[PDB]
Amino acid sequence: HVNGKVALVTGAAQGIGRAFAEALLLKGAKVALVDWNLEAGVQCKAALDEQFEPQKTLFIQCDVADQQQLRDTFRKVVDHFGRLDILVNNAGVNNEKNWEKTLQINLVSVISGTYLGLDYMSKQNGGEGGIIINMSSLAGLMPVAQQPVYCASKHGIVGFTRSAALAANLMNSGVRLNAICPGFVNTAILESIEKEENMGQYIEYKDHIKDMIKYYGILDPPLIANGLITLIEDDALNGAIMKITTSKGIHFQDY
Amino acid sequence: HVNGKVALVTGAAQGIGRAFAEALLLKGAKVALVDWNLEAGVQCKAALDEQFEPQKTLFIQCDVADQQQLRDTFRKVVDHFGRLDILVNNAGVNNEKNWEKTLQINLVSVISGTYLGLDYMSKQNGGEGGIIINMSSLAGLMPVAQQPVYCASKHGIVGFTRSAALAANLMNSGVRLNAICPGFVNTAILESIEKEENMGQYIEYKDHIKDMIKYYGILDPPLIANGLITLIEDDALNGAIMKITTSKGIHFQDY
Numbered sequence: 169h170v171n172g173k174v175a176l177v178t179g180a181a182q183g184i185g186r187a188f189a190e191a192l193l194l195k196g197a198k199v200a201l202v203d204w205n206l207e208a209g210v211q212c213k214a215a216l217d218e219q220f221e222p223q224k225t226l227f228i229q230c231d232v233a234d235q236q237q238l239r240d241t242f243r244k245v246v247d248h249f250g251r252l253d254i255l256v257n258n259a260g261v262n263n264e265k266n267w268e269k270t271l272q273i274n275l276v277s278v279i280s281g282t283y284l285g286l287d288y289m290s291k292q293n294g295g296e297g298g299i300i301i302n303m304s305s306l307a308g309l310m311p312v313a314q315q316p317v318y319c320a321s322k323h324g325i326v327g328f329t330r331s332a333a334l335a336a337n338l339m340n341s342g343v344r345l346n347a348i349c350p351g352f353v354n355t356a357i358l359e360s361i362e363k364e365e366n367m368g369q370y371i372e373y374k375d376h377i378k379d380m381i382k383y384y385g386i387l388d389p390p391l392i393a394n395g396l397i398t399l400i401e402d403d404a405l406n407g408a409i410m411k412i413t414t415s416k417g418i419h420f421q422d423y
Numbered sequence: 424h425v426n427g428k429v430a431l432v433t434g435a436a437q438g439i440g441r442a443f444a445e446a447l448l449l450k451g452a453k454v455a456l457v458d459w460n461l462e463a464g465v466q467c468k469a470a471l472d473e474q475f476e477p478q479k480t481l482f483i484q485c486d487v488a489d490q491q492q493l494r495d496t497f498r499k500v501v502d503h504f505g506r507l508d509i510l511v512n513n514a515g516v517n518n519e520k521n522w523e524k525t526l527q528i529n530l531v532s533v534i535s536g537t538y539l540g541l542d543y544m545s546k547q548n549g550g551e552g553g554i555i556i557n558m559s560s561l562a563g564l565m566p567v568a569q570q571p572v573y574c575a576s577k578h579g580i581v582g583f584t585r586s587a588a589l590a591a592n593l594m595n596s597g598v599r600l601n602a603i604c605p606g607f608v609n610t611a612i613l614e615s616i617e618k619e620e621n622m623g624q625y626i627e628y629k630d631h632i633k634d635m636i637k638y639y640g641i642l643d644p645p646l647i648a649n650g651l652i653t654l655i656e657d658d659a660l661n662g663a664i665m666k667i668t669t670s671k672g673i674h675f676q677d678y
């Protein structure tokens with residue numbers, strides 16, 4: 169189901185997004201790597217081009233929270249690769265200080281990107297259907313005392329995705345929407361909990377998170393990519409909230 | 424436990440917010456009615472003045488989604504009444520068409536209002552503690568096919584409020600933060616499901632909501648206000664997610 173498909177992955181320069189790009193590439197997708205960090209993107213594209221044919225990937229610099237630029241980016245992806253099959257709204261930040269920007273990136277941009285994915289992929293517009301995967305977190309399901317707004321953002325993604333999936337069935341768009349909710353993942357974002365710039369008033373309680381990181385353990389990005397691929401290959405999965413934890417592996421929130 | 428306390432209720436001009444204001448007035452609070460609807464707000468305070476003493480209420484016109492107005496409105500309330508004890512972040516809209524505004528109103532404003540509430544009320548800032556109640560919805564706990572962004576916003580409030588409650592404990596702020604998640608309530612917002620202006624692309628699916636309304640029935644605003652009073656009066660309730668249904672009345676989400 170993945171071979172020959174065109175995926176747009178936001179936040180693809182590193183971490184989970186990069187892992188998605190690699191997993192999709194390994195299974196024969198073409199991937200637009202979309203990220204606001206041009207330097208990390210360049211390095212990512214360089215590394216991918218050592219493992220994959222260059223025609224298989226495209227780097228586009230975009231701040232997903234800039235809606236005009238996001239729209240431009242979708243236009244570029246479809247102009248470059250001719251179609252869109254898979255959208256992964258993966259970009260996210262931890263910033264409890266500039267918390268409005270956290271909401272803009274983590275939630276608003278997931279909704280706007282989702283809506284663009286439906287415009288490009290819905291059968292209602294003559295598309296072939298497709299899949300949209302949105303990156304939530306266990307923080308989308310349970311509280312995080314040291315990051316309430318991050319928590320808010322990931323909760324929003326759960327409710328939004330479950331609802332949009334239901335609406336997709338009703339509209340016969342042919343688009344399946346699912347969300348992934350990882351435990352801690354071994355990526356650079358974990359570093360953010362050390363910085364008053366990112367934690368603001370919550371910086372003083374950062375060691376509680378550091379303890380949870382060690383006691384729950386951390387997930388390898390490839391494992392999340394495995395979850396991604398599962399979602400993409402199983403066309404029964406719509407509205408699914410996929411949980412990935414070190415203890416229970418890849419499973420689902422039941423409602 | 425309520426007598427002589429100062430309450431700020433957003434969305435106070437009508438609906439659940441008006442019910443909160445009345446319930447609080449009945450229990451001896453002073454209430455700042457904050458709402459963007461000048462006409463409704465003026466008539467609300469006029470109606471309240473016929474039943475309660477005029478000095479117990481202050482109407483302030485404010486778009487809560489305008490953070491500068493919100494901040495200013497907080498300053499005017501505390502200047503007028505001399506302190507803040509109870510913040511009810513109750514304003515919300517249903518608008519899946521200009522869904523960015525819906526997030527600004529339903530989620531951004533709840534967080535910014537909460538943060539303002541804590542600025543005044545936290546012990547660590549020279550406050551004497553108090554309570555913040557956020558208005559979620561059952562849409563904060565489950566999907567709504569015909570209003571995905573409303574759902575996202577209400578989910579956001581649940582994640583935010585449970586998280587901030589835990590933080591308030593860590594920080595010994597002396598503030599309790601709870602959320603209420605009603606089923607359908609007999610207010611003017613129910614009319615919006617009939618309008619393309621509010622429903623946008625989901626307008627064609629509104630009958631499903633209408634069917635749920637007939638299925639579940641409709642709650643009276645005063646019952647919701649009874650839920651508010653329960654939260655204010657019980658100092659053991661922090662991070663509680665109160666559900667109010669026709670079937671079960673006032674109860675709590677168990678996690």
Ligand SMILES: NC(=O)c1ccc[n+]([C@@H]2O[C@H](COP(=O)([O-])OP(=O)(O)OC[C@H]3O[C@@H](n4cnc5c(N)ncnc54)[C@H](O)[C@@H]3O)[C@@H](O)[C@H]2O)c1
Binds near residue numbers: 178258349351
């Ligand atoms: N790592 C974890 O523990 C964890 C757990 C649960 C969920 N998540 C979520 O997984 C997703 C991926 O994060 P990660 O762990 O790989 O972190 P990361 O910080 O290493 O990678 C995030 C990537 O997104 C990009 N990005 C951020 N804001 C952007 C914007 N406005 N426009 C474009 N690109 C932007 C960054 O430049 C970066 O390349 C995020 O949504 C994060 O919230 C992470």
Ligand SMILES: NC(=O)c1ccc[n+]([C@@H]2O[C@H](COP(=O)([O-])OP(=O)(O)OC[C@H]3O[C@@H](n4cnc5c(N)ncnc54)[C@H](O)[C@@H]3O)[C@@H](O)[C@H]2O)c1
Binds near residue numbers: 485488513561
């Ligand atoms: N009525 C329901 O079935 C139901 C169910 C669950 C939750 N809720 C929530 O209850 C709350 C109260 O809504 P309601 O049912 O009383 O509806 P309503 O439309 O009758 O009242 C909402 C009030 O909020 C005000 N408001 C809206 N946006 C504002 C803004 N930007 N700035 C200032 N004031 C603003 C409106 O002017 C109005 O007076 C909302 O948060 C709503 O989402 C309602």
Ligand SMILES: Cn1nc2cc(N3CCOc4cc(C(=O)N5CCC(F)(F)CC5)ccc43)ccn2c1=O
Binds near residue numbers: 360
């Ligand atoms: C059984 N079990 N339960 C849990 C609960 C987990 N939590 C609760 C605390 O905060 C979290 C944050 C994020 C999160 O998205 N992060 C980490 C902090 C950040 F880097 F800033 C942003 C990205 C994910 C999960 C959790 C984790 C593993 N867990 C597990 O294995």
Ligand SMILES: Cn1nc2cc(N3CCOc4cc(C(=O)N5CCC(F)(F)CC5)ccc43)ccn2c1=O
Binds near residue numbers: 561573639
């Ligand atoms: C057991 N049980 N389960 C449920 C589920 C309910 N739902 C799911 C569908 O949508 C909702 C919307 C709102 C909501 O906040 N609204 C209504 C629509 C609006 F006017 F536009 C905005 C404000 C509230 C609840 C529900 C309702 C009662 N329920 C019950 O009693």
